[PDB]
Amino acid sequence: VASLRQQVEALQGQVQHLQAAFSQYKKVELFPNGQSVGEKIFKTAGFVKPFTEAQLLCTQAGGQLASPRSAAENAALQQLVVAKNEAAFLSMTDSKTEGKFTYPTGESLVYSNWAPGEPNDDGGSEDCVEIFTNGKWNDRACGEKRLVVCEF
Amino acid sequence: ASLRQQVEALQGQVQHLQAAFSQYKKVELFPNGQSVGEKIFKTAGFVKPFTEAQLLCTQAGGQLASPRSAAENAALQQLVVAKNEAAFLSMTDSKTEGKFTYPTGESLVYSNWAPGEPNDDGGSEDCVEIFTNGKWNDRACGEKRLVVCEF
Amino acid sequence: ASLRQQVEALQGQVQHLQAAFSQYKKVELFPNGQSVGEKIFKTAGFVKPFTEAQLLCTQAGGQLASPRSAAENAALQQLVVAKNEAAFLSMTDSKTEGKFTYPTGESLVYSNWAPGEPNDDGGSEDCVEIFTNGKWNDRACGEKRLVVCEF
Ligand SMILES: O=C(O)C(=O)C[C@@H]1O[C@H](CO)[C@@H](O)[C@@H]1O[C@H]1O[C@H]([C@@H](O)CO)[C@@H](O)[C@H](O[C@H]2O[C@H]([C@@H](O)CO)[C@@H](O)[C@H](O)[C@@H]2O)[C@@H]1O
Ligand SMILES: O=C(O)C(=O)C[C@@H]1O[C@H](CO)[C@@H](O)[C@@H]1O[C@H]1O[C@H]([C@@H](O)CO)[C@@H](O)[C@H](O[C@H]2O[C@H]([C@@H](O)CO)[C@@H](O)[C@H](O)[C@@H]2O)[C@@H]1O
Ligand SMILES: [Ca+2]
Ligand SMILES: [Ca+2]
Ligand SMILES: [Ca+2]
Ligand SMILES: [Ca+2]
Ligand SMILES: [Ca+2]
Ligand SMILES: [Ca+2]
Ligand SMILES: [Ca+2]
Ligand SMILES: [Ca+2]
Ligand SMILES: [Ca+2]
């Protein structure tokens, strides 16, 4: 029984060292292309793609396109867009039913930050969403190239 | 007697750490890495000649990409396709012409040569590149190719 | 001995996590990072003026590269050599000309000035860069240099 005492204690020290080391590496890893907010992490690829290609990249990496669900998440995403000075695609589209924007799950939006007058389906062919450097959203043609930002 | 409550607590801490680490690992590999089994490939995202590429990987504590199976080859091919640039592998036939080896000297356990390859073209192709179609071609070591290290 | 089984399971998890973490460290540092003692330097891989560079590091939870020993300086120098671009350090004589301080206000505990430096060239150099040879030079804060943060 005294043997299990020492093993628990030795493991407490190893766990503590891992926790400390990992805390440092979290900051290192997100510099300069990531942003943590709550339990979510946004990470930019640093390049532009059309929506279908961008969506595929995020899903293949085990994430999904940026899907801000609150003001705080939106502002964190905005920091990356500002840093790269390039609008980014979000995950959401009205491809299925025009006028009705949904997450890739099909769920209706729980938060939006549309620029005034948006979404406007300009030219009758804007089914994707971009976030500007000011944090506001705009519906945009899915074939256009925008900053790839994934969430994990 | 109540080590129990320390062990239950320590287990919660370790499981929270596992979850965070798992998330940070996915983040780390996007967009310049691929995991396959216990192996991780990561590109530097630029090109170098072979000796410089090999040094970069060894100094980083890895080695140049060394796919030992079709699954590892397919994972490496994803990075090459993403950067649209052929990458150096670790293997050479510098010691014995026509006999490709890993940096340890071990003979190949897997290959994916393009038709007609290896051909030692020009009489001096002792390095190996992987193309965007995943096939291999022996290449002059002085040429600049994408640097991909395995860890 | 019901605990004894759960301790052995927990040991397995921790040992696996230690090995995974050590691997992940190598991956993370390749190719833009360097670890020296308990400090980690990481380059953003682009250039900015000092004020913008300083803000990027502080917002990331770190600060501009601040080498405090020859060993730290050599670790930083590897990144500068790899990018082939001189980098800003954290230290400035913006408060009192000719007296360089850390952002804390503390005076320098280590320096590696190039011959002749610091020279306040044009009466307008209050920031510090590190060259590819590792030596330091005072430089105008409005110039664009490699962003390197320390964590
Ligand atoms: O770079 C862009 O934002 C565009 O794609 C601009 C486009 O230029 C054309 C201008 O008529 C039109 O095809 C499109 O502008 C419309 O759509 C924009 C975005 O929703 C596209 O997704 C709007 O930003 C734009 O509004 C602005 O211009 C109008 C008009 O002056 C011209 O249509 C203003 O009423 C409005 O306040 C904005 O200044 C427009 O709806
Ligand atoms: O990129 C630079 O080094 C400069 O900023 C060059 C500038 O050119 C002008 C030359 O008269 C002057 O305004 C400045 O050069 C002086 O300052 C430099 C730095 O302190 C700027 O922060 C020095 O590097 C430079 O000296 C270098 O060149 C001289 C010359 O002999 C040319 O070979 C050398 O004596 C010295 O070893 C350096 O190589 C100069 O002091
Ligand atoms: Ca539509
Ligand atoms: Ca639409
Ligand atoms: Ca629109
Ligand atoms: Ca030969
Ligand atoms: Ca050969
Ligand atoms: Ca060949
Ligand atoms: Ca001054
Ligand atoms: Ca000065
Ligand atoms: Ca100077």
Numbering used by the authors:
A (entry chain B): 204 to 355
B (entry chain A), C (entry chain C): 205 to 355
Give sentences copied directly from the paper behind this entry.
The innate immune protein human surfactant protein D (hSP-D) is a collagenous C-type lectin prototypically associated with the lung surfactant but now identified throughout the human body. SP-D recognises a wide range of pathogens, through their surface carbohydrate arrays, leading to rapid deactivation and clearance through activation of phagocytic cells. Numerous studies of the binding of simple sugars to both hSP-D and rfhSP-D, a recombinant homotrimeric native fragment comprised of the neck region plus three carbohydrate recognition domains (CRDs) which exhibits significant biological and therapeutic activity in vivo and in vitro have been carried out both in solution and through 3-dimensional structural studies. Here we show that hSP-D recognition of Salmonella enterica sv Minnesota rough strains R5 and R7 (rough mutant chemotypes Rc and Rd1) LPS occurs preferentially through the inner core Hep-Kdo, with hSP-D having the flexibility and versatility to target the terminal glucose of R5 when the preferred epitope is not accessible for binding.
